[PDB]
Amino acid sequence: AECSVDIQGNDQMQFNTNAITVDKSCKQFTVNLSHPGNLPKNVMGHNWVLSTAADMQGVVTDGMASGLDKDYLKPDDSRVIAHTKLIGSGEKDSVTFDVSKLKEGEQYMFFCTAPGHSALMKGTLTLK
Amino acid sequence: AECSVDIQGNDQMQFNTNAITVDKSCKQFTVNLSHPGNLPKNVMGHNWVLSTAADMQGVVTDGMASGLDKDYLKPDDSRVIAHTKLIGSGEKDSVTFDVSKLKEGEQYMFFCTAPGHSALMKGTLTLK
Ligand SMILES: [Cu+2]
Ligand SMILES: [Cu+2]
């Protein structure tokens, strides 16, 4: 609906969509992170980070060397715009960020940071 | 088959099984690693590593820290009783090993070492 998305993350390492379209009719955009499945955090754990595709891998790498204890995300990451916290199945989590934080025509991509989940748990965030 | 498992590494981190048996009536065993799935090595690579349940941790670990140009295994890993290579989309590779390396009543474990894969990609080797 209006200024929020209902995004999923399953047991298959599948986000529900690779497409997030953020209208300019906004100042705040919310991400409704959900996880159907029956797998715990330490197994099929998901998250949601935002950043320039340029920096993506920076997040990923750093995220990786920071453990589950740091939500597979370096403490205070200047590349991380928005970001949720890791979540297991039947769990939930939201994040809000300022639409003004996203500069016109730049590469925006979303993705889980849990080791080797990056790959196919990715997306493009388009500022409409 | 006899001696013999063909295991399956698909795309959604699911090795076909969770248990492999190695009858005592063998000096040597042989494992068939297929790879159903359109996804490249670097993306969703698979292997087959064998060790006590005791070293697993150390092996998933050191492995991870070693890179796709080292099939996420640590050169000459003494903990590793036998391993295949890391296979891309549809690729194939086998391992053949001396069953006499195995001591009954020990907990043996098989698994992939690709970053956050052993989560789901692990199982049981039973010297029957
Ligand atoms: Cu994930
Ligand atoms: Cu694997």
CA of A22 to the centre of ligand 2 (A): 35
Residue in this structure with the two tokens 């996804």, named with its chain if needed: B39
**Chain A to chain B, count of Cβ pairs less than 8 Å apart?**
28
* Cα A11 to ligand 1 centre (Å): 8
Three-state SS letters, B21-50:
ECCCCCCEEEEEEECCCCCCHHHHCECCEE
In angstroms, the CA A127 to CA A108 distance is 9
What are the residue ranges spanned by the domains of chain A? 1-128
**Bind-site residues of B for Cu cation:** 46, 112, 117, 121
The first and second tokens of residue A125, run together, are 């965030």
The pocket of ion ligand 2, defined by CB under 5 A, consists of B 46, 112, 114, 117, 121
Rg (CA), chain B: 13
For chain B, helix (H) and strand (E) counts, in that order, are 2, 8
Q: Which residues of A touch B47 (CB under 8 A)?
A: none
All residues at 6 or more sequence positions from B39 whose CB lies less than 8 Å from its CB, including other chains: A119, A120, B11, B88, B89
Q: Which residue, chain included where needed, has tokens 């474990």?
A: B109
Neighbouring residues of B36: CB distance < 8 A, sequence distance ≥ 6: B8, B9, B10, B11, B90
* Nearest residue of chain B to residue A117 (CA atoms): B116
SS3 A52: strand
Q: Which of B20, B120, B10, B107 is nearest to B60 (CA)?
A: B120
The strands making up B5-8's β-sheet, listed across from edge to edge, are B5-8, B28-34, B93-98
Give yes or no for a contact between A42 and A34, defined as CB atoms under 8 angstroms apart: no
Ligand nearest to the CA of A113: 1
| Chain A: closest CA distance from residue B41 (Å) | 11
The chain A residue lying nearest B45, using CA atoms, is A116
Is the CB of residue A14 less than 8 Å from the CB of residue B13?
Answer: no
Nearest to B21 by CA among B40, B43, B3, B42: B3
Residue B92 C-beta-side C-alpha neighbours within 13 Å: 7
Q: Which fold has domain B1-128?
A: Immunoglobulin-like (2.60.40)
Q: Looking at chain B from residue 65 to 94, which residues have their Cβ under 8 Å from any Cβ of chain A?
A: none
